[PDB]
Amino acid sequence: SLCGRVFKVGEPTYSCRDCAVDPTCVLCMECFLGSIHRDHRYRMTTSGGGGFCDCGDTEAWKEGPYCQKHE
């Protein structure tokens, strides 16, 4: 019911510069584009692999902790 995605090599990753609690907080593309943060200032990277999507971690986001799929 929640995301829990582990990033794969080459996978696009997004952080909301406005809402992230700190610079380690990130979303997969599915969760980013299904969240409020698609209309905010963001930082996109291409993943080296490993790490995980923070969708649903209510302590990672100051607003919009979930996307529309996982709410």
Binding site: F7, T13, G50, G51
Partner: peptide
């Protein structure tokens, strides 16, 4: 979180 990002892996680093």
């Amino acid at each position: 979180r990002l892996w680093s």
